[PDB]
Amino acid sequence: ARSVRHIAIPAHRGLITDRNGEPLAVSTPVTTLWANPKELMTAKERWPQLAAALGQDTKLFADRIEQNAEREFIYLVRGLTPEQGEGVIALKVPGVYSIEEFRRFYPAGEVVAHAVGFTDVDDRGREGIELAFDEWLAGVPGKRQVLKDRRGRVIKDVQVTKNAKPGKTLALSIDLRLQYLAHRELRNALLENGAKAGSLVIMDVKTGEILAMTNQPTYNPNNRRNLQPAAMRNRAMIDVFEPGSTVKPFSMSAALASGRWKPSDIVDVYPGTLQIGRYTIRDVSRNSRQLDLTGILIKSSNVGISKIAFDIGAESIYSVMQQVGLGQDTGLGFPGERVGNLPNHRKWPKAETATLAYGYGLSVTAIQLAHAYAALANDGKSVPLSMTRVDRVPDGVQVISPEVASTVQGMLQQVVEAQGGVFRAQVPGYHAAGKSGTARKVENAYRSLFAGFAPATDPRIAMVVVIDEPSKAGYFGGLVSAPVFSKVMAGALRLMNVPPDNL
């Protein structure tokens, strides 16, 4: 008998870089050694020396080969360097053959780990960008017909196909400089507050581009041996959570659009509680009677935003939240990326109306929350999300009216820059705007939130900062996540050369 096998000619996997061409995932040539057990069996004397080369026990190596004595192909090792393979080749062991394979390295390392992801042993993507663009990155391999006599001799070897086409280069939306800023400051904030986890997303409000996406804890994907389950969670995309106060600005956008509310209008929130059946809504700050709409956001009055929700109805508040992407399919097409839940009750009762209004009644991801604020900074027009670079920007959906959007922008600039506002969130040199949040997890654990965008006069980037159960200080968003927002934004804006607008 003869043996007719088909053997693939590997395709150089497409380079991944950041938006500016800095290398993030590079396929470098390496050597994988393979053996023919039929040929190995005729030179047993050479086995132990080869076991030493592979760093394996002499007996086990011998046991493994004998067991596979009928087979014609087995792996010895995969992905040794060229010099590394030459040392094992120079033993001149009968039955030992080699091929040039490609293996993936990641020069940015842990700073972009969850975003970029990584590949299998076969050089196919199994996480992050590597997976969701695998077809783009893989290329089309070649094919060889190798004819052999069952003994160890090539009779015919011919390429029965076009030459292996390399994969396509992929520039991400991510700017590595911004990512590195995000990365370190999130990390700094965790140590400062003794928090167990965190996420920080940066978005380009005009282009739909994810300029940064960093999670904590992280991992070096180059060394994936002692991997903890929690370190590999892409939290920005997979940790769903109730946004709480951070969606109050969308409740207000539905109020302003109803035709029944202006910013100067007033709601009585005395005495900081609200009986609804047996359920009792409560504000944290209970030194208020009449607050205007900016006041409701500054004080973060759950009572105020519930009363407004009773006036206009839930249907309208839901509509704005659904259109801005909250609890909705994101489109990026990522592996196991969470969608959340924005229930559509159709006709809401009292309690549900309130709960949804102050953000307890839904669950979202950090990416969704960022995308939502991007629309609000973008004069109410949502431009589709993108993890890859967007040279030709796709036309965006106007989801909130331009004048309602401009009003709510002005309100969020007030929450940051007014008296008794979230002053820690201020970004020197620029007019900033945003909203703190503090969600209780259900011995009390808290998520510290802050969404926002800057500069006020012509918004460039939206930013979301999530810090998971801090403990070495306070826990409110205004205290914990506001200063992170401040620093990262202060640096992020200057790295892109955005002109100062507080002049």
Catalytic positions: 245
Asked if 414 contacts 425 with a C-beta cutoff of 8 angstroms, the reply is no
At 91, give phi and psi (nearest 5°).
Answer: -70, -25
3-class SS at 265?
coil
Q: Are strands 381-382 and 290-292 parallel, antiparallel or unpaired?
A: unpaired
Give CA–CA dist 494/54, Å, rounded.
51
Cα distance between residue 497 and residue 161, in whole Å: 50
Enumerate residues 6+ apart whose C-beta is below 8 A from 265: 292, 293
Smallest Cα–Cα separation from 346: which of 370, 368, 313, 371?
Answer: 313
SS3 288: coil
Cis status of the peptide bond prior to 23, with omega within 30 of 0: no
C-alpha 369/C-alpha 384 separation (Å) is 14
Write out the two tokens for 415: 């929450």
Q: Among 30, 33, 46, 35, which Cα is nearest to 83's?
A: 30
